[PDB]
Amino acid sequence: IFEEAASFRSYQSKLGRDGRASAATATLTTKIRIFVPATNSPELRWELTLFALDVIRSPSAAESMKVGAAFTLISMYSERPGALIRSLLNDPDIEAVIIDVGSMVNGIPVMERRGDKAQEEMEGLMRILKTARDSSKGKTPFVDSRAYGLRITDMSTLVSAVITIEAQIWILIAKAVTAPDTAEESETRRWAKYVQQKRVNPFFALTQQWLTEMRNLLSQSLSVRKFMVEILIEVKKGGSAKGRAVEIISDIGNYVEETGMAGFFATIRFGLETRYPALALNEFQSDLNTIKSLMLLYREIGPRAPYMVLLEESIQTKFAPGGYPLLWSFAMGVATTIDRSMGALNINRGYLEPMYFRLGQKSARHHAGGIDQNMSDQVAELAAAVQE
Amino acid sequence: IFEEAASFRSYQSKLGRDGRASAATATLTTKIRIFVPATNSPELRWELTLFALDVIRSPSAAESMKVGAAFTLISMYSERPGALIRSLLNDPDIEAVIIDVGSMVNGIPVMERRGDKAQEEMEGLMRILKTARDSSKGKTPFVDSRAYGLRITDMSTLVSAVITIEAQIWILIAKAVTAPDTAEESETRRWAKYVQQKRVNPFFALTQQWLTEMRNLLSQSLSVRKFMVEILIEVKKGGSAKGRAVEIISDIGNYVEETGMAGFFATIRFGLETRYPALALNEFQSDLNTIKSLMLLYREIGPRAPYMVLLEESIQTKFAPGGYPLLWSFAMGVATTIDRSMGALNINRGYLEPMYFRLGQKSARHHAGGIDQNMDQVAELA
Amino acid sequence: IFEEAASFRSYQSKLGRDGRASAATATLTTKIRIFVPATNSPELRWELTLFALDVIRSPSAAESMKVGAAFTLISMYSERPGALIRSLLNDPDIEAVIIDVGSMVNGIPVMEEEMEGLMRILKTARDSSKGKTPFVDSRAYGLRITDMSTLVSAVITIEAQIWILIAKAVTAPDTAEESETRRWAKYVQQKRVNPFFALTQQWLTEMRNLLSQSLSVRKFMVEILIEVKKGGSAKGRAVEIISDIGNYVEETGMAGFFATIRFGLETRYPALALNEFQSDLNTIKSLMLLYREIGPRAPYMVLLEESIQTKFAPGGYPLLWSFAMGVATTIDRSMGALNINRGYLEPMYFRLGQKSARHHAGG
């Protein structure tokens, strides 16, 4: 009877989820040039890191070059850098041409030594690098200038530095596509952790100017974020020890999971986990059936789930908290009242209904935390603890 | 006994739904010309986009050409544009001739392969382009005019632009055939989202005037909506990686689903999901049995169901509320009273039964604010 | 119904735990040189200890050498030094090159220009340290020990001085002295440890700092520390001192888990089923079962920098934790001296949890 309705709501939610898309939908691939580490020697590499930092710093280079540069910069992790990028990079939007650098002996950019893309290629590069320097008022990547010039000579220094720069990319992911302004507070909080824990090599601490330029590149490019989230999923999978580089990524992951799905987890933490005596309220009769459908749906979305927002994954929209709005408005009302850390959150969403929120705020709070709906005069004594 | 009646109501509802329609019903075909990207090279692709934007901007081009132009414009997604159209286009009203000229040496219009015989064609195109410019008082497609003028030089610029225009077509679809006036609030709200989220490249922003001209073309052509809904179903299917183009479409999809079937879900959301004490209203019984049969029917109709309105699908009538108006007038009465966002939707139909709707409302008020459906602090909730 | 939600919270937490990592993750491997104990002679063992103490004391010596030194120093336990390191060392970031010469003619920094680089390193080490030698009372630093019994007495004494550090190196790398002395008192009072080999505060601080700042070393240490801890073996003097230190080292840097579990939660004060804590208890349940699933590394998660450690970190059950600290501080005289000035603590719940126990000797 009633059972059919609930099952039908669930049916709608899962209808047409299935099936495999026709190949005709395959979109025009965008060509990106990625210069990639040609040998496992610090001589070739350190210079290439400097080049890549500067490509991303450049006002003068085209966006197509800049994406490819960012891919160079955040593939320095690998034992075999070019192979790591080419083999894991898996998105239809973008078609890579991979160039293994020829020892990178021509200052900051790299040239085709024998077969020539063009003789002016180096100038397209020289222009890029000059514009980069000039527009940034001389500033090298690191906050203390000696580090910008370093030209490091051994594996030990290399790994110290590379781990440092990589960690500074991965600090960004956490907010680049969830709140790319307001960012500084959080990204500095995460910086402090890695340094205080001695996980990253502090000589290589990177300038706000460089970090903002990279944060913006991440916000505005899908193709980059796709590679990042591909790697972020791959290294999140268990059953491996990690040394310093991959370890910092994995560590950051524990902050990066669920990010930009605030509302979903918020309904779970506040309101739902809370289970006040008022859950069966008429609205809650349906909204609860909604949440059930949502949870089973979330399960079905599967391996991508922890990072849907970073992936721009459309399924994400369905998961968005506006989907159960009566229960959610009550979930903010309870959550704000009960958890001291919450409420600091940005609560301006259209699906908030004041009347339902007020009940959630007061129903819990005037309830002294839902004292009445808890399940030697235990009840009464707990009055002191409420302090209101 | 009583069981037979319930089964019989269901039987009536499903009766003669089955079987396969005779091929003799094959309709008089409309012949339409679709100019389609001949090569994956930016020179041709930019020029062809300008051609197509102008076809849609024109007062002077014929409707048959304009539909074919709109199909050019919203197939710009494809790596092989001709293949994308030919392979997804699947509707027996409209029969395409696909012209895949890549040479684009014909200025504003396409080149004509017949040469001197195409001379009439080329001047028809010229008239179309002139009339487009003149009728629009000089306004190019984009809101900031430098963009409208800008000939593009790379893949990067191309994809930025194409993604941008495509997104601007797909924003329309959700309301073009559900409420083609009153549209602005919703379509701007969706515009704001895609831009704020940095999903599409704002240098390419398309003018209100052009978008209204195209929205109207979409409302008044079935053939265009058929191709759009074909694509909208195809890319809604899961288990595929997407590039930026298909991703924007898919994202829009999540707003486009259920559109123009307001009433069907409203009985589900309000009244039904609510499980109010009055579900046991004696009168109600037969209507509840009705709605149940409808919901299971809806399920059985299957793949087209999320976009039934856009497809003009006949079955839609049945799913129409007003097919169960007693349980419906109560469902509006509950819904509008209990959900703060509802009631702002214009619900004024002749099938509404005031007394029963007020029973729905009173359901709230006489419920002591819905205490009736409590499911000793069941009235402690000012 | 409600049961599904609790199960779902748990599902989210354990989702993506599974699977095996793509080779593409492999980071650029660092070469480290390890001089390693040549054979069963006190001659080699003492000289190598002196070499290693000086490598750590050196102002001029490279990080790559220093780590390798540390690995020599804390492989002294084994019957076959170089084999013990090579066979237990199981970390991808580092590739060890082992030198295991019985020749031992080359004290601390021996040749295989390089030899003069080594000489500069050793000179700079001596000079910068103002001659201050490994052991606290000078004759002990100077004295060659020549036979098995004296050798193992000495080696186990230096090694125990390394292993006293692990207990705080990655959890409180300053303010260390109090703890390391407290552990020293135990081993001496129990007559396990030979005070002739007392090691100088200058050297101990230099080594403590090396442990804090090098991950690769700590990885190997914790690998060994876990391996020997595993059951069904008797230990004689050397391994016994490690095992003894282990009883301070276990659960380290998981204070919040054990503390909120032991104090507050296991105490189960009749305010346990708070209308606000229901989700948190469900949280902690999920946490405990998760902890189980993480398995063998669990007693040393923090020391291993193990990622999931983050999930176990105490901010994960904040309501219960704030309340439980409020109980713990009230009931246990020794607690509360533990620094809980953290941003995630809930004042209101601490005032309540504290009150619930200390209402009137309420507990």
Next chain:
RNA sequence: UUUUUUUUUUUUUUUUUUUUUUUUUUUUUUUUUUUUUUUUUU
């Protein structure tokens, strides 16, 4: 040795009523924003 009397009788056809008449396009919401380490002793 055995012991009586036995059937049938009524009623019976047909009669009413039986087309239809209402209602049924749509219209609201829908991106993102918080905290995520560490510091007792045995």
